[PDB]
Amino acid sequence: ELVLERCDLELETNGRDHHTADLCREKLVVRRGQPFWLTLHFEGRNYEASVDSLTFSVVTGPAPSQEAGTKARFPLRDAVGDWTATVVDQQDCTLSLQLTTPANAPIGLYRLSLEASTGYQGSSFVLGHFILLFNAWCPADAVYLDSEEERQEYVLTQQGFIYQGSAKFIKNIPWNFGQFEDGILDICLILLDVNPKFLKNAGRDCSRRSSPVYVGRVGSGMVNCNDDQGVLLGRWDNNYGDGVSPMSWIGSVDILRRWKNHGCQRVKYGQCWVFAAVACTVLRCLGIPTRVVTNYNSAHDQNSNLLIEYFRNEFGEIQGDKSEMIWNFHCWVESWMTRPDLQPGYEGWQALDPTPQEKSEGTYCCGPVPVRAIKEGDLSTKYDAPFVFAEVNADVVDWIQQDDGSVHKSINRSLIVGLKISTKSVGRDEREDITHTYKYPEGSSEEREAFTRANHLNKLAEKEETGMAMRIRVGQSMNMGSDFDVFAHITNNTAEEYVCRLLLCARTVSYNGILGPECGTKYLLNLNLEPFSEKSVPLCILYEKYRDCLTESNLIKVRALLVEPVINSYLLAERDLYLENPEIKIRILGEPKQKRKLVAEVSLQNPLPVALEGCTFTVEGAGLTEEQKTVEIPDPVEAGEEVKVRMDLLPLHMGLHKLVVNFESDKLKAVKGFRNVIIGPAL
Numbered sequence: 170e171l172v173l174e175r176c177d178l179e180l181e182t183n184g185r186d187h188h189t190a191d192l193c194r195e196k197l198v199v200r201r202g203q204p205f206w207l208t209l210h211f212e213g214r215n216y217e218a219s220v221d222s223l224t225f226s227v228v229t230g231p232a233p234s235q236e237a238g239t240k241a242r243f244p245l246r247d248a249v250g251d252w253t254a255t256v257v258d259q260q261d262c263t264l265s266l267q268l269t270t271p272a273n274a275p276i277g278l279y280r281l282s283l284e285a286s287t288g289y290q291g292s293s294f295v296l297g298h299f300i301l302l303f304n305a306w307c308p309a310d311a312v313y314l315d316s317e318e319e320r321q322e323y324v325l326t327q328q329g330f331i332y333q334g335s336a337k338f339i340k341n342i343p344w345n346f347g348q349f350e351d352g353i354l355d356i357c358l359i360l361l362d363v364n365p366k367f368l369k370n371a372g373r374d375c376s377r378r379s380s381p382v383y384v385g386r387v388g389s390g391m392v393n394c395n396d397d398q399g400v401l402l403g404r405w406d407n408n409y410g411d412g413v414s415p416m417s418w419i420g421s422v423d424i425l426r427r428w429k430n431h432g433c434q435r436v437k438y439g440q441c442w443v444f445a446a447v448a449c450t451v452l453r454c455l456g457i458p459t460r461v462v463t464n465y466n467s468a469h470d471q472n473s474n475l476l477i478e479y480f481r482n483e484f485g486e487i488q489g490d491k492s493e494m495i496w497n498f499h500c501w502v503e504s505w506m507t508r509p510d511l512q513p514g515y516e517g518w519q520a521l522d523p524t525p526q527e528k529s530e531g532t533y534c535c536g537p538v539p540v541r542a543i544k545e546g547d548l549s550t551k552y553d554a555p556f557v558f559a560e561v562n563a564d565v566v567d568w569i570q571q572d573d574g575s576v577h578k579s580i581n582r583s584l585i586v587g588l589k590i591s592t593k594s595v596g597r598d599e600r601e602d603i604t605h606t607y608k609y610p611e612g613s614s615e616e617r618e619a620f621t622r623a624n625h626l627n628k629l630a631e632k633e634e635t636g637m638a639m640r641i642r643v644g645q646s647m648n649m650g651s652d653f654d655v656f657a658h659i660t661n662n663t664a665e666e667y668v669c670r671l672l673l674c675a676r677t678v679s680y681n682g683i684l685g686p687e688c689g690t691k692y693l694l695n696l697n698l699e700p701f702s703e704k705s706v707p708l709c710i711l712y713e714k715y716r717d718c719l720t721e722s723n724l725i726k727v728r729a730l731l732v733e734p735v736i737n738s739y740l741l742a743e744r745d746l747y748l749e750n751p752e753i754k755i756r757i758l759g760e761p762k763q764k765r766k767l768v769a770e771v772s773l774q775n776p777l778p779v780a781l782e783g784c785t786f787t788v789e790g791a792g793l794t795e796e797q798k799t800v801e802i803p804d805p806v807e808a809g810e811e812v813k814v815r816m817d818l819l820p821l822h823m824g825l826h827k828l829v830v831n832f833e834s835d836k837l838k839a840v841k842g843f844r845n846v847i848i849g850p851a852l
């Protein structure tokens with residue numbers, strides 16, 4: 170006889186089972202180390218265990234292999250070696266089986282073949298294709314996660330936060346990771362099939378795709394580091410006219426499509442957080458638990474030097490040059506995986522930085538490195554451990570040039586490298602400070618033994634000082650578009666009644682330290698600091714004077730130098746201010762039902778003293794819309810005037826979904842907004 174077979178279902182109950190339902194559209198997607206249904210339909214005759222002998226087989230790489238774990242064929246039994254296939258039932262003409270993949274099977278697209286020998290002839294042919302992803306729900310996988318909610322937050326959650334602003338005033342920008350949005354997966358696989366490791370050796374690369382640590386390095390680096398074939402092209406000068414302001418993006422989904430759609434050409438402008446964000450989009454898609462992290466006062470781009478020196482004129486103005494400033498904040502991601510290539514005990518959060526930084530040789534990116542490693546000072550652990558360490562533990566010394574020879578060391582108690590290291594909370598919208606996962610508490614013994622495995626025992630504070638302290642105070646929150654005051658707060662806990670020189674300089678900065686022109690300055694050369702008192706000196710920062718050179722990050726750096734001629738003492742104090750953007754009102758009109766119209770009304774009230782022209786509202790959100798939505802406000806919005814507009818959306822998936830929006834205009838760019846929306850049953 171001869172086996173028939175007129176069908177081959179893959180079911181969607183597989184999607185729900187492998188937490189890949191959304192990803193399950195016209196092509197089965199599953200997660201390794203777990204079994205999936207597979208019903209077979211034959212015509213007339215069913216399966217005859219007697220005479221019929223069918224064996225399965227699957228290949229993945231463009232150059233499969235039994236030995237390279239990129240190809241494997243296996244018997245069909247009802248017993249149970251990893252790559253198995255067994256009969257779970259069979260009736261009428263149908264024959265439902267259950268295949269099982271290893272918990273280390275390489276990820277990618279597989280071709281499922283069927284070997285039928287209804288005696289000696291039989292027929293051998295394909296059954297279909299499927300995408301195997303990292304399984305975080307499988308204990309045997311290297312990315313396993315015990316906590317269910319953590320699995321949700323770090324793998325399935327499509328919306329999220331990226332922390333910006335300042336350490337003294339953190340700001341949470343909404344982001345649409347949309348890793349399960351149509352096409353995004355396929356663009357991810359492509360992203361892998363076009364990296365060096367793969368072109369240099371398709372088999373080798375396609376094989377190693379069973380390692381989260383390998384895949385992580387590949388993805389991370391395919392974002393920027395070596396744009397020989399990357400996804401985003403960096404740009405920091407602040408002239409993005411022929412592309413998209415890095416601050417304008419509100420989700421990786423569009424950048425990825427803009428990438429493939431333009432024949433894999435680096436997309437027009439992005440920056441460290443944009444890299445980290447799409448990186449998170451990529452890894453999450455593939456199944457590796459990832460979360461984007463933010464670090465304030467990051468000693469980035471330094472060659473890794475755990476010691477940085479700056480030389481300033483008699484105004485505290487970093488006379489330096491060629492020297493890199495400390496970043497207001499720098500972003501990278503963290504990925505959850507085991508490290509079967511390191512002295513056990515280093516499983517967990519691996520820090521991956523998709524931002525290239527001039528290194529002790531050339532220009533590439535870093536990670537993955539165990540965070541627990543960066544905490545211990547185990548700078549020898551594989552994958553740029555030294556950089557991530559200085560990124561968080563660099564030391565800084567501010568020298569002030571003597572207008573008559575050498576420089577004099579100054580006291581700058583207002584700077585700290587590695588501040589409020591943050592990332593979104595698991596299952597909530599609050600922020601989670603994970604600074605404790607990188608550094609031991611100051612003073613502690615663990616901190617001393619750590620700075621020792623790192624030879625960073627450069628920390629013997631000048632707890633003596635000369636009886637004075639200074640810090641910059643802002644009073645209250647200041648908004649983008651107005652004037653406001655900042656203060657140089659001088660404290661004098663001494664019997665002496667000094668006379669100083671206080672130099673105050675404010676300047677608009679970019680998120681990475683690139684100082685622009687001064688937007689406010691005051692210099693008092695005969696400041697009287699009466700005994701045991703405190704003096705407060707004002708600095709008026711005018712809109713009219715910082716509006717021209719402000720970046721989309723609304724950052725302005727205030728600097729103050731207090732000079733005491735007598736004992737010849739220099740006290741330095743700087744602070745980065747964040748000008749608050751106008752809020753975006755969001756109303757959800759109608760009933761949030763699945764596969765049903767939905768309307769979103771968004772308003773914004775022009776905060777500037779001048780009108781607003783070419784105002785644009787852009788909306789996105791995996792679960793609320795398939796495509797981005799943009800509306801253009803035809804006429805200008807005068808100084809007082811508010812802007813309002815509605816956008817018809819068609820939620821397709823139920824559950825929770827965060828709607829991210831971005832407002833653009835000629836004088837007010839990249840102001841963000843977002844709204845949590847619960848989509849229920851249509852009925």
Ligand SMILES: Nc1ncnc2c1ncn2[C@@H]1O[C@H](COP(=O)(O)OP(=O)(O)OP(=O)(O)O)[C@@H](O)[C@H]1O
Binds near residue numbers: 338641
């Ligand atoms: N850069 C900033 N942008 C907007 N608001 C800020 C900023 N920095 C501080 N604020 C706000 O100012 C108020 C007080 O903050 P904070 O106490 O840190 O500053 P300060 O009180 O002026 O200085 P200090 O507390 O050392 O005397 C809060 O509303 C805080 O959010």
